Amino acid sequence: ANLAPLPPHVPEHLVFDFDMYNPSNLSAGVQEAWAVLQESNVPDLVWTRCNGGHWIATRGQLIREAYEDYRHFSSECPFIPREAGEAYDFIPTSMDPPEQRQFRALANQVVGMPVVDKLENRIQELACSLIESLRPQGQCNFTEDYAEPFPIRIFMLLAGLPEEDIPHLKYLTDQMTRPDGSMTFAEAKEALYDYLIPIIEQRRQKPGTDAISIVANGQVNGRPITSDEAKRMCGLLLVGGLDTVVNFLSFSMEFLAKSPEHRQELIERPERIPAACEELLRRFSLVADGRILTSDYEFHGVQLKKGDQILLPQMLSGLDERENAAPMHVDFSRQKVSHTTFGHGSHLCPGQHLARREIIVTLKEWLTRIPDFSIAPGAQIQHKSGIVSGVQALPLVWDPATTKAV
């Protein structure tokens, strides 16, 4: 295919041409497609000539180690291909400690556990209303009818943005994680910034109680945050709010629809939902970004060159059979659910608490109202791969007679 010429410093035996935006075994499921990187024929650290050429760490050990060592593995250029990585200037993700710290503190403020706790009632409220509205229909297009509106509307409420702007923003955020080829990466990013700029200016002058007002008027390093810094942070918040939980919920529901035994498990033993959420986060992990080498560095017997990009798939740690036995099997009773679904190191996800709350609320409220459901007959669910992977469509069906109006 479109393979870049092999750099002189890369041993031929370490080459494995994996395409993160279109993996070969995608039809088997996106996580399954990525897991081919963990078969016996693939070394721990390999070089793919796809997408401009870059390294890929395939084991949890290397992924965790790399995410911790920011001195060698910089977040300055975190996305593949390099073009995207270089245009990517979100805050604080494109920064390494110490610089990142002050901005991350501010981000924790607007999406951290305290915010989640205060927002739980709205989360509960929306989940219940959306699910009840669908219950009597006996069918739904999950991605469009719940997966997107639920987490996204909660985020828009948090950020104090009009739901009317969702379609526009959602299209843009997805061009940065799973480009469909209709927009260049930098242009999609700028479009996001063009939208935010006037809003940030407005909320710095006349601050509201929303997350954007909080960010735009925050302080970093003992001084006021700049309009541009606030912009670069809010841009990141939009992506996290619009293209993370949204995708994960579909992977989870697709699975539950296909496994009555697991649904039954959660209906008969509700207290197991939190554990189930965690196991699902491992099995259907969906993120994969990376870092750039700050200098020549030998890593686990492999010579890495300054400038080289290395993909450190957050998705792979939990699927690594070295971290979890029978990794592709969902066991809600797994004693130790090991994963790096929310990242690792200084950039570990601050919105993970909001994510878990939304997932757990979704599982409890959906199963209590629509306990029995399955994939629409004749439907063949397909996935999409990228920085954040997802489910293209998920047609679900159930018998309204077996549902319960709460």
What residues make contact with ligand CAM under the rule CB under 6 A? 90, 93, 177, 239-240, 244, 287, 289, 387-388
> Has 128 been labeled as part of a binding site?
no
CB 207 within 8 A of CB 198: no
> Rounded distance, CA 324 to CA 20, Å?
23
How does 238-265 read in b/e, with b if 16+ C-beta sit within 10 Å?
bbbbbbbbbbbbbbbbbbbbeeeebbeb
* Backbone phi, psi, residue 74, to 5°: -85, 145
Q: How far is the CB of 37 from ligand HEM (least distance, A)?
A: 17
**347 near ligand HEM, judged by CB under 6 A:** yes
**318 near ligand HEM, judged by CB under 6 A:** no
Cβ partners under 8 Å of residue 403, min gap 6: 135, 136, 369, 370, 371
In the complex with ligand HEM, which residue's Cβ is closer, 104 or 383? 104
241 contact choice in K ion, ligand HEM, ligand CAM, none (CB below 5 to 8 Å, kind-dependent) = ligand HEM
Q: How far is the CB of 210 from ligand HEM (least distance, A)?
A: 13
Judged by CB under 6 A, how many residues of this single chain contact ligand HEM? 28
| Crossing angle for the helix pair 352-369 and 273-283, to the nearest 10 degrees | 120
CB 291 within 8 A of CB 75: yes
Q: How far is the CB of 93 from ligand CAM (least distance, A)?
A: 5
**63 near ligand HEM, judged by CB under 6 A:** no
> Rounded distance, CA 291 to CA 308, Å?
9
**341 near ligand HEM, judged by CB under 6 A:** yes
CB 200 within 8 A of CB 161: no
**246 near ligand HEM, judged by CB under 6 A:** no
Q: How far is the CB of 85 from K ion (least distance, A)?
A: 6
354 contact choice in ligand HEM, ligand CAM, K ion, none (CB below 5 to 8 Å, kind-dependent) = ligand HEM
Render 257-275 in DSSP notation, one character per residue.
HH-HHHHHHHHH-GGGHHH
Question: What residue numbers does the annotated binding site for heme cover?
Answer: 349
List residues near ligand HEM by CB under 6 A.
75, 78, 92-93, 100, 104, 107, 111, 155, 236-237, 240-241, 244-245, 248, 287, 289, 314, 341-343, 347, 349-351, 354-355
